[PDB]
Design a protein around this ligand. Structure first.
Ligand code: MYR
Lengths: 90, 92
């Protein structure tokens, strides 16, 4: 996994993550794809650091949307979308 | 607008509820909210109605009562009915 792959997977989620509402089907599909790449501990740590940079990338990101994205998409997300996540604990 | 692929993808988490009953999940209610939000114009609503109709007929074990009660169980006012047999021309 690479940070560009992660960015591409999270792109459809930016409207939901910065404006609220509901994640679209495209957003949930991208998150599902990225979750499928974060299997191994090293994949999980790398994807986590990429997701952290991406989260800090988007302005006025709403943490309620980030926290509720896994339940709104039906995913047990192995890498949380946080600006402040310590990826070593993943 | 809305496309049949969007309708399929948003209603997919609802298939367990639509075929077995019970309660709709969080993902199902989220997809139903998204579909409600994409059906803005009356033309969007008729297009969505035909897509949802195809999706409903896709499962031969679909419970029409669960389809009818899905919006209320989710707390959503869905502007397009979910029916296997609806004539989508008669909707507004
Ligand atoms: C069960 C709720 C029925 C919705 C009909 C009332 C109209 C409000 C939303 C209808 C379709 C959305 C279009 C819009 O709000 O511009």
């Amino acid at each position: 996994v690479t940070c560009g792959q992660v960015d591409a997977n999270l792109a459809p989620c930016v409207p939901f993550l910065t404006q609220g509402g509901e994640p679209g089907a495209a957003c949930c599909s991208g998150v599902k794809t990225l979750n499928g790449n974060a299997q191994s501990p090293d994949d999980r740590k790398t994807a986590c650091n990429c997701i952290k940079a991406a989260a800090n990338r988007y302005p006025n990101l709403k943490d309620d949307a980030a926290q509720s994205l896994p339940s709104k998409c039906g995913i047990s997300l192995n890498v949380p979308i946080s600006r402040t996540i310590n990826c070593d604990t993943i």
